[PDB]
Amino acid sequence: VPAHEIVSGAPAELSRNRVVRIYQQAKPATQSGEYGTFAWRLDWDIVDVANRWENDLIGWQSSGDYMQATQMKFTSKESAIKFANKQGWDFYIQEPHHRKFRVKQYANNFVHSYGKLKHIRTK
C-alpha cells in the first residue's frame, strides 16, 4: 500500500493523534425514508479539550478542532478502507445493521382464538 500522507500536505499530528471512523448512517427512527443510508461516511472522533467551548462574550460555540465539520461520503466499504489506510489514518469501522425479514399478513390480525383471547385488537 502506498503512503500518501507526506504528499497531501496534512500535518503529522492529524495522522498520528486522531482516530477516524467509517460508518453507514443509521435509518432514522423519526421518518421512514432510507436515502441517506447508502454512502459510507468518514468522520473523526472528537478531541477531549479541543472540541467546543462556550465563549465568554456571547455564548458562541467556539472550536479548536478543525476536522469536526468535515465528513466524507464513499460508495463502498472497501473504497473507504483503501482511502483511509492510503492517507495513513487509524480507523475503526462500524458494521451496519439491517432489519430482520418477518412475513406479514393483514389476515394475521383476526385469526380465531380457541382458548383465551389474551388480546383485543382495535384498528
Partner 1 sequence: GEHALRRYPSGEERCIACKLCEAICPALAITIDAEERIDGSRRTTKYDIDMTKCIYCGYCQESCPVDAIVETPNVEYATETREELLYNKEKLLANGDKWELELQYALDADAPYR
Partner 2 sequence: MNSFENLAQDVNITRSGKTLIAKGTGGRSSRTGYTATVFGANGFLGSYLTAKLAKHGTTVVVPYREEMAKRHLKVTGDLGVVNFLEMDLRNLESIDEAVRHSDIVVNLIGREYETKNFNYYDVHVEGARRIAEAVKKHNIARYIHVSAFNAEIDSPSEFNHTKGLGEQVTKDIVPWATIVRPAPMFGREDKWFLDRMARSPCLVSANKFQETSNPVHVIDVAAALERICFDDSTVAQTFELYGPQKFTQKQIIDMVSETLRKEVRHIELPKALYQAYTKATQAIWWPTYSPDQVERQFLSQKIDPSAKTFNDLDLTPMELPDLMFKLIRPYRVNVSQLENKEKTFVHIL
Partner 3 sequence: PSWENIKDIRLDPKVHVDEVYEPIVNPADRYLQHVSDLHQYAKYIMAALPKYIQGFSVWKDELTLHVAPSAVIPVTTFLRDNTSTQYKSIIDITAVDYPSRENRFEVVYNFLSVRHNSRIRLKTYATEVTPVPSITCLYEGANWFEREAYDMYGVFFEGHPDLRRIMTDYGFEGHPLRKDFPLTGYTEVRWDEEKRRVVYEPLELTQAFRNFSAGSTAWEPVGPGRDDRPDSFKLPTPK
Decide if residue 19 touches partner 2 (CB under 8 A).
Answer: no
What is the spatial distance between Cα 39 and Cα 41, in angstroms, rounded to a whole number?
A: 6
64 is a contact residue toward partner 2 (CB under 8 A)? yes
Exactly one of 38, 60, 66, 92 binds partner 1 (CB under 8 A); that residue is 60
12 binds partner 2 (CB under 8 A): no
Q: Is 38 in the site for partner 1 (CB under 8 A)?
A: no
82 binds, among partner 2, partner 1, partner 3, none (CB under 5 to 8 A by kind): partner 3
Q: Cα–Cα distance between 53 and 32 in angstroms, integer?
A: 35
Task: Collect all residues with Cβ–Cβ distance below 8 Å to 54 and sequence separation of at least 6.
Answer: 60, 61, 62
Query: Closest distance between partner 2 and the C-beta of residue 66, in Å?
Result: 9
For partner 2, which is the closer residue by CB, 10 or 39?
A: 10
Question: E-strand spans in 8-111?
Answer: 19-24, 40-44, 52-54, 61-63, 72-74, 90-93
- 87 grid coordinates: 492517507
| Rounded Cα gap, residues 23 and 33, in angstroms | 18
Among 53, 75, 79, 92, binds partner 2 (CB under 8 A): 53
Using CB under 8 A, count the residues that bind partner 1. Answer: 4
Residues that bind partner 1 (CB under 8 A): 57-60
